[model samples]
Target: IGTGFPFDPHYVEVLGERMHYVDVGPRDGTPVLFLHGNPTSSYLWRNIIPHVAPSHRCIAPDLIGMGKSDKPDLDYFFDDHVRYLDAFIEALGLEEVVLVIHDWGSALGFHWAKRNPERVKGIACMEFIRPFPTWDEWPEFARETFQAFRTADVGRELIIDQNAFIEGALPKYVVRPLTEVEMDHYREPFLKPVDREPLWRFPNELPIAGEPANIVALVEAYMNWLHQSPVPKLLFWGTPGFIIPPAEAARLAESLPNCKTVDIGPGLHFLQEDNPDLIGSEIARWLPALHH
Candidate 1:
């Protein structure tokens, strides 16, 4: 369904990297920045952008080494990713932003908000929630998987860049089947062996616990921000998504005093593909308040 939209692709220099992003909607509309998750890019939002561009300005950027952005073969740590995003927001002088995040976007975007609370107006989230992974909170399977990534090379490749693994396993994580078009949107960036390194890097950044896990702490701090801020938040949850567990999503809804939750049942890790109408409408409804 994504075709022939008037999207202006632009590049910005952040952390010595040239990043690509889409700047759409009105020149003076309220800014709503959307962040993409792992194994996906800014392209995933293709369906939702057109729905909101007329009324609210939208900025969707390909995170470093993902989508159309340049992928440098280096250590792509979570904190480094957060640093670049902070620069991106400041470079644009974007203020009172309505933050939209998913997957890894949750880690990076919320960290950005934590650092600049005044710049944030609200957040619209789907398939993303946080808190440093506590052993008490994680399921045994997740802990075992994280250990594999941390210890074994095979685990790293499977979690990070193996398309065959993704194609076979992703369906199991979601309640809905991903469309061919949506699959393409997720796979287009990591088409080559080299293109897949960023995928590998994301999981390798997982932490063990407290102070030693600076990388985890950097993103975990954002989860803590929701507790402190009065900003209105929305969580669009898909019951079967892997990245954001169902229990975690519920905890997120309850934790945020100003937050609301919506259901995307029978959905999967790629929730947008299954329930774009509900999520798109939800954002359209919530985003305008930031302007008012």
Candidate 2:
């Protein structure tokens, strides 16, 4: 329809935009919804979807700004992202779903699950946690970086521009090097300075300890969900060197009773880039057991 990132050969249109997705398996197969994080497109599931799609009806779309799903100039706030997702779910009429979430994808998917608890079957997470009301227990390192991005101009360069951010941050999380082709895929979004503005704003958008006005309210809503729901959740971490540390993943595991935690070795923040097979298999194995 339009030129952005060429979508996966299997795109299903929904809500006026091309939802770049991989929908495979029997039409009646149980549904597993895959949500990805910042700075990545549906390309995040390139590896993961193949393994799970054979058994379940897997659906993954590039969110508005991140992937091929129409990145128009707009405010990419966290709450706004959740609203679009809610509409997406309603558009599809998905019910009793197994949700796989990563990075900000976790926040978007989990925020939706919190609102429609009965529709969520299980959740799998990595590199993200629902925000808490305050940062009293947050480590100094995380606190410092979050504040830096939120308040300083350096974040404008380092965090906003795709080339600068990925080149700088990707190596730390990825154990093996990113191939030229892979790096190109990641770089596709910010081809121009104007295209790069929203990408840059994501770092500044993080709601740390629920501070910074609108962010705190989002956390308060999530915290309430955490306490009230008994949804089954699992966390699979890509080891170390991620913005959201593995230790924090462990802390989240302890808080959500139905949640279990695992460390899949040698993962990057773009966890799917490195560990799509494991992530896909985890969802395949995880979803069936919950169907009953």
Candidate 3:
């Protein structure tokens, strides 16, 4: 309904809440599901979807409480979204799915794949959660900041009250400057503190130091399944990346069967904002090989 989101929005019922999504391209084509994480919406895929839409049924949705989705009252934990996500896929009856995901979005895909491994045809991920880094791996200031975020009232104050993720952290992570026009699109969904709960909860759910044993447990469980799954996967990355640098991507790629890595260039955590064209094109080129 808002601007900058060019496609028509589609709504689907999942556990009584409506999920907002962009559905483009062939209805019968193999579905390419694009998932965004934390403060971002399907809006995150605006630049990338068109590149693949002609050949694939591209579906990108705002999770339960993010983007234009109906935000019901609850703790927006990773668990919360996973349940809704599982049903959202079930609701669509998607088969032979190809997932294009990032950040916590990767977690949703990995967890789903762990349970329904045979359904996934291919995966393309950038800056995805892996085994995750320990407390020591995080820089001093970064660790301290995250500790404060995990705190109760203080985290709410920083995220919900102040909208730090939408206004502050998101811009800083992107290597290139975010324009006011672009910021408005990201900002529109989270103008009020109440709507910012998902942003508040997302950082808290990160498995750093294994603070939240629950999500870490899911990631760990999926790791073993992922290791054995023969699905064709593509790991996209950039130079000086935040989560998965080229080296780590190469390392992870070596361990997984039928998996490959692509370097797009110049990024920190939010690789898509830095290089959507390459990310989109790489995925477009990569998926055809899955036919074999």
Q: Rate the local accuracy (lDDT) of all candidates.
A: 0.72, 0.68, 0.84
Judging by TM-score against the true structure, name the best candidate: 3
Better of 2 and 3 by TM-score: 3
Between candidates 1 and 3, name the one with more favorable lDDT.
3
Colliding pairs, model 3: none
- Reference-based lDDT, residue 179, model 3: 82
TM-score of each: 0.86, 0.84, 0.95
Provide C-alpha RMSD values for all models, in order: 2.8, 4.1, 2.1
Which segments of model 3 are wrong by more than 4 Å? 1-3, 139-141
Model 3, total clashes: 0
Candidate 1 backbone collisions, by pair = 174-268, 175-267
lDDT string, candidate 3, 92-208, tens digits: 888778999998899999888888888889989888886555877554446666677787889889888988888887887779888888899899888778988888888889888
| Candidate 3 global CA lDDT score | 0.84
Comparison by lDDT, 2 against 3, better one: 3
RMSD value for candidate 1: 2.8
lDDT of 1 by residue, 73-165 (tens): 766777667777788877887877888888788777777778778887888888764544565554445666555655447765675546532
| Model 2 poorest ten-residue lDDT run | 1-10
Compared with the true structure, what per-residue lDDT tens digits does model 2 show for residues 73-135? 667777557756777776777777778877778778777877778888888777765554465
